[PDB]
Amino acid sequence: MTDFTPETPVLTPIRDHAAELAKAEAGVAEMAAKRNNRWYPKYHIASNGGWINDPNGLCFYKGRWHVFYQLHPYGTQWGPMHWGHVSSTDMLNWKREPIMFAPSLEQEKDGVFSGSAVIDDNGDLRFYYTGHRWANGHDNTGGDWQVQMTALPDNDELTSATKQGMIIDCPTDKVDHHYRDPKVWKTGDTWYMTFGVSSADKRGQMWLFSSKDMVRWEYERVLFQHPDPDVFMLECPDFSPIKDKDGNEKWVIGFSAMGSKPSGFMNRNVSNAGYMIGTWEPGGEFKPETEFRLWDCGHNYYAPQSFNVDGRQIVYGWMSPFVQPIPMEDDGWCGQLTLPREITLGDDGDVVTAPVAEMEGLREDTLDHGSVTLDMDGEQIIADDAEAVEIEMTIDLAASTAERAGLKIHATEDGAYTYVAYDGQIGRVVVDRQAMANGDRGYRAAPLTDAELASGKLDLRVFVDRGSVEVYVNGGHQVLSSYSYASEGPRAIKLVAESGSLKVDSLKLHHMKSIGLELEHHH
Amino acid sequence: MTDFTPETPVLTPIRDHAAELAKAEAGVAEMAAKRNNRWYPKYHIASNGGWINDPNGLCFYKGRWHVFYQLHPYGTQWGPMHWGHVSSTDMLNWKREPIMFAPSLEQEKDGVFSGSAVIDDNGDLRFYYTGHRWANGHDNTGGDWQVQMTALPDNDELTSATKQGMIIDCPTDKVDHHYRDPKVWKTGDTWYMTFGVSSADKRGQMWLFSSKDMVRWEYERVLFQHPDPDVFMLECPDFSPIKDKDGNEKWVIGFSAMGSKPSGFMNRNVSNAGYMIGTWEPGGEFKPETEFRLWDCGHNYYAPQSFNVDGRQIVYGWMSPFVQPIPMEDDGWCGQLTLPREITLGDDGDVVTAPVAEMEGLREDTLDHGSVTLDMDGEQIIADDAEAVEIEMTIDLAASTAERAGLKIHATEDGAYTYVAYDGQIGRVVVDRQAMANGDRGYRAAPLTDAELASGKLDLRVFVDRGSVEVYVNGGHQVLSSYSYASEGPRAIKLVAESGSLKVDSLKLHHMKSIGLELEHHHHHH
Numbered sequence A: 001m002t003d004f005t006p007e008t009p010v011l012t013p014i015r016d017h018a019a020e021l022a023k024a025e026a027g028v029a030e031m032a033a034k035r036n037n038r039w040y041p042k043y044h045i046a047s048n049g050g051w052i053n054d055p056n057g058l059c060f061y062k063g064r065w066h067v068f069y070q071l072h073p074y075g076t077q078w079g080p081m082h083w084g085h086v087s088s089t090d091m092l093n094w095k096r097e098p099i100m101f102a103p104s105l106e107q108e109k110d111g112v113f114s115g116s117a118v119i120d121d122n123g124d125l126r127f128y129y130t131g132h133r134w135a136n137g138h139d140n141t142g143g144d145w146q147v148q149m150t151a152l153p154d155n156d157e158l159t160s161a162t163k164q165g166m167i168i169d170c171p172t173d174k175v176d177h178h179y180r181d182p183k184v185w186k187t188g189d190t191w192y193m194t195f196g197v198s199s200a201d202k203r204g205q206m207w208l209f210s211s212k213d214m215v216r217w218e219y220e221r222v223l224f225q226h227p228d229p230d231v232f233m234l235e236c237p238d239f240s241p242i243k244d245k246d247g248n249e250k251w252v253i254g255f256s257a258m259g260s261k262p263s264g265f266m267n268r269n270v271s272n273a274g275y276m277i278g279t280w281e282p283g284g285e286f287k288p289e290t291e292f293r294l295w296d297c298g299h300n301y302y303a304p305q306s307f308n309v310d311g312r313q314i315v316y317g318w319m320s321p322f323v324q325p326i327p328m329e330d331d332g333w334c335g336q337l338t339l340p341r342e343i344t345l346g347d348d349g350d351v352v353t354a355p356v357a358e359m360e361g362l363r364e365d366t367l368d369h370g371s372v373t374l375d376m377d378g379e380q381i382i383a384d385d386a387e388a389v390e391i392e393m394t395i396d397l398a399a400s401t402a403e404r405a406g407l408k409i410h411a412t413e414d415g416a417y418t419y420v421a422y423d424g425q426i427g428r429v430v431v432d433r434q435a436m437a438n439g440d441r442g443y444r445a446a447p448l449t450d451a452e453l454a455s456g457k458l459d460l461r462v463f464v465d466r467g468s469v470e471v472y473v474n475g476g477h478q479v480l481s482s483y484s485y486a487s488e489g490p491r492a493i494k495l496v497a498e499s500g501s502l503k504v505d506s507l508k509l510h511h512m513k514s515i516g517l518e519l520e521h522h523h
Numbered sequence B: 001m002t003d004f005t006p007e008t009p010v011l012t013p014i015r016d017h018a019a020e021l022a023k024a025e026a027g028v029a030e031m032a033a034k035r036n037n038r039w040y041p042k043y044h045i046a047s048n049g050g051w052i053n054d055p056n057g058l059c060f061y062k063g064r065w066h067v068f069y070q071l072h073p074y075g076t077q078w079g080p081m082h083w084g085h086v087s088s089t090d091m092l093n094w095k096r097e098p099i100m101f102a103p104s105l106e107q108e109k110d111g112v113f114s115g116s117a118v119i120d121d122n123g124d125l126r127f128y129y130t131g132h133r134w135a136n137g138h139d140n141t142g143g144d145w146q147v148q149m150t151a152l153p154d155n156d157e158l159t160s161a162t163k164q165g166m167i168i169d170c171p172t173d174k175v176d177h178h179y180r181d182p183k184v185w186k187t188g189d190t191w192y193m194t195f196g197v198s199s200a201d202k203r204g205q206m207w208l209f210s211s212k213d214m215v216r217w218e219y220e221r222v223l224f225q226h227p228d229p230d231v232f233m234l235e236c237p238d239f240s241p242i243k244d245k246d247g248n249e250k251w252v253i254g255f256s257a258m259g260s261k262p263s264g265f266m267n268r269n270v271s272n273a274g275y276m277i278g279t280w281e282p283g284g285e286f287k288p289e290t291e292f293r294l295w296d297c298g299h300n301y302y303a304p305q306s307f308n309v310d311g312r313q314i315v316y317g318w319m320s321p322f323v324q325p326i327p328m329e330d331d332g333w334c335g336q337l338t339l340p341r342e343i344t345l346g347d348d349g350d351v352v353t354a355p356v357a358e359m360e361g362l363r364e365d366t367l368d369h370g371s372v373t374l375d376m377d378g379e380q381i382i383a384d385d386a387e388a389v390e391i392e393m394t395i396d397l398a399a400s401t402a403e404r405a406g407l408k409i410h411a412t413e414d415g416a417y418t419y420v421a422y423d424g425q426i427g428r429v430v431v432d433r434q435a436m437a438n439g440d441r442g443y444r445a446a447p448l449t450d451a452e453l454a455s456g457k458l459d460l461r462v463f464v465d466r467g468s469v470e471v472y473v474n475g476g477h478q479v480l481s482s483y484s485y486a487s488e489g490p491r492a493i494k495l496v497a498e499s500g501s502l503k504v505d506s507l508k509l510h511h512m513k514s515i516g517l518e519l520e521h522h523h524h525h526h
């Protein structure tokens, strides 16, 4: 009826969903068949073929972990949006599932955009997602035209769903196009949805709705507007309560912000995700108590989604390749997710995102190097050939006189490498790709607080996969995720000290198992 | 000892200077004969053999430019100090002169330390230099024992000089050993002297003496005390008036400071030389109007000395290797000077040190690339084997989206290189040695002001020599000088853009001429 919030869903089939699924399966299979594994992850989620982006429909349900993701089943760049799907009983051994969604309704005809999953009062899962149309009916040049949809699984395995159609329409004149990425949750006795919006005045907002049956929605208010007028859109919003060190609940608002200008080491990527911590009276505005901070300070990270399982809030991000050249796109796939992280609040009151505990189960072994000291400028080989490894190290900052020091990873015979370092001139942990022979380069620098610098010790937990590095700083107080497209031959890891000494109190290497998604793998 | 300024110089010969000089000449010629030239400069002043340090006795005198330097004629580490000497009519073609000074007087018996040369009221040159003894008669554990000495040239070509002896003794009760590096100049009717002192309370100071005849000196006051208590000593002090284009003079005090702790990008080297700008009325104390700023932001630069000729103030620095490993020391030499730079004041009132204009005469050719665009992250090859070259480039900061961009030099087949880059996250120009296969590494970052960063353009003039790089930013507003010990094989130069585009409005390469100091008859190119 043009009520922005229809009283019952608007279901408008226009394509055979089974046949569209079958065509998507074929597209993925053509790319998987010719895939080059040189940079393909051994222990991160990627499509078996094609481009992926945002994680979606994240849940634990009926005895399995489920990860869905935005998928272009016909090439290795972004294109008509589908949802792909992997599942696991343990977060360690994963299986590929049928493609879940292809566009089949009028309001999503140009893409099945990002969405989430939530378990209702009866223990039944519901999906919420955005349906995308080109505003001009053609291509991106006239902008987006977006609405919110819902669907219900057909089975406990979540291998297929019945779509129910549009539940929240777009009031065209109140929005500047962008209108997407829903999250639904229950607080007290009321169900709430939020999603991202660009206002009529082009400000990034999260809107709030409420529902009693999860299907018919009512507009409540604007939950949050981003204080920087350069920020015009908040994609992939997140909102959840997290227990602080005193046992009090804080609300952590999250989004993937479009429009910020880079400043110093902050907001360096094309778009940038992060958080603020604050308070919320249910039904009211979010009241921030902190300035914006990045979820991840690395080169390649965006669109994180979080979900709750038995009191734990767990988050995946997409490692987003927004900058040319992207050489993995020649290899029949593009895009992986980060490892799953747990969102906690540390003793200093700030968000901490350590890997979930289950990730310890990736370790095949432990090579304990003990304490290592470099007395002056130099290097030591820690590994002659590391395809997929985790390094844990603690550096004694107070004793080490090196100006910069850390690990060169993917250090190949042509002299290329990616450098994970503490840099003492700036008091930050960097990932620096200047010497890489493939992909775009640059560096990214994660902040250390005065207390972290005064502590005298610095912990790094570094996950190297075939095409990527993730650096967890001080137990995931900060994280930097970045692609690292190793050159050919053996891929060394080297401990490095520049212009002074380096005292490493503890250094351990673990080889990483496969999560079973690459299938049979060679060497 | 309140007469620590003798009415007449104290001359105490203890060795035969001519025989000591002859021994030093043999030391240097033997190192030169075996020298390895892989990192040896083509167009910077080094010893032909042995270690050097501070530039000394700089002047233009009787039609010639003269450069002397601290020299250890018997090895490639610091050792018994001598003065070596090179001269030229044109700053482009230099001639190796005889060693000028060897230790031969009581008060300098453990070394002829640093010093300067000034032209007196009659137009005759006079040398002033510090004589060194160990306080404990044998080594450094007892610290230094230092006094000021003077000497006169024997001929207009300064091929030799006659020592006169000590003119200023050390009131050892008042000073904590350090007492060195004199500079003499005239203001008004009066001659002044300054040198560096560590006070009794271990504060770095510069003292001011006066004279009307240049040989008899009189204590006036402490000219300056370093406001950072960590700084115990101010070596190689400089003090000179610099004109703006506005017709005012400012006094620029300079010092090579010991004791400062590193902080952020500032004061990163073992010791660090820099300046303050302010005012001075003759006889009074220096009044600083600026905070301390580095002369040179690079890895390897210390002990600058400047001199005045015809309204120009010209400065050389020693490229100081303070940090292990120092690979050139295995090659029969160690250390080189920077190119000569002119001190001026720029539009913001800060010191600028461009290369002197005579350095244009080093260019053998010009390979003009015109404007060059990288549309995205990438590299273009500028040279495949650049031994000694100058690259001039103007970056269009307004149009370049690259996060970091510039030149990789000494870029060898093993993947090693030294990177000279504008870094847009820190708003600085860096020299980063992280990828070098020889020498200590790390990076140095020279500041750019808010006005420079909002300029549409950034100028870089980069001199690569066999073992070094010097990067002159925005016409010398900042400079970075750093050793870069290239690996073997062809040494490429690459233009680099990271993570965005790079628009270069002009890019030119010039091959550099030899300055004629690398000549060695045992080395047969052949």
Ligand SMILES: [Cl-]
Residues within 6 Å of the ligand: A264, A265, A266, A447
């Ligand atoms: Cl920051």
Ligand SMILES: [Cl-]
Residues within 6 Å of the ligand: A385, A386, A387, A388, A389, A511, A512
């Ligand atoms: Cl491995």
Ligand SMILES: [Cl-]
Residues within 6 Å of the ligand: A038, A485, A486, A487, A488, A489
């Ligand atoms: Cl490869």
Ligand SMILES: [Cl-]
Residues within 6 Å of the ligand: B264, B265, B266, B447
């Ligand atoms: Cl600084």
Ligand SMILES: [Cl-]
Residues within 6 Å of the ligand: B382, B383, B384, B385, B386
């Ligand atoms: Cl060439």
Ligand SMILES: [Cl-]
Residues within 6 Å of the ligand: B385, B386, B387, B388, B389, B511, B512
């Ligand atoms: Cl050359």
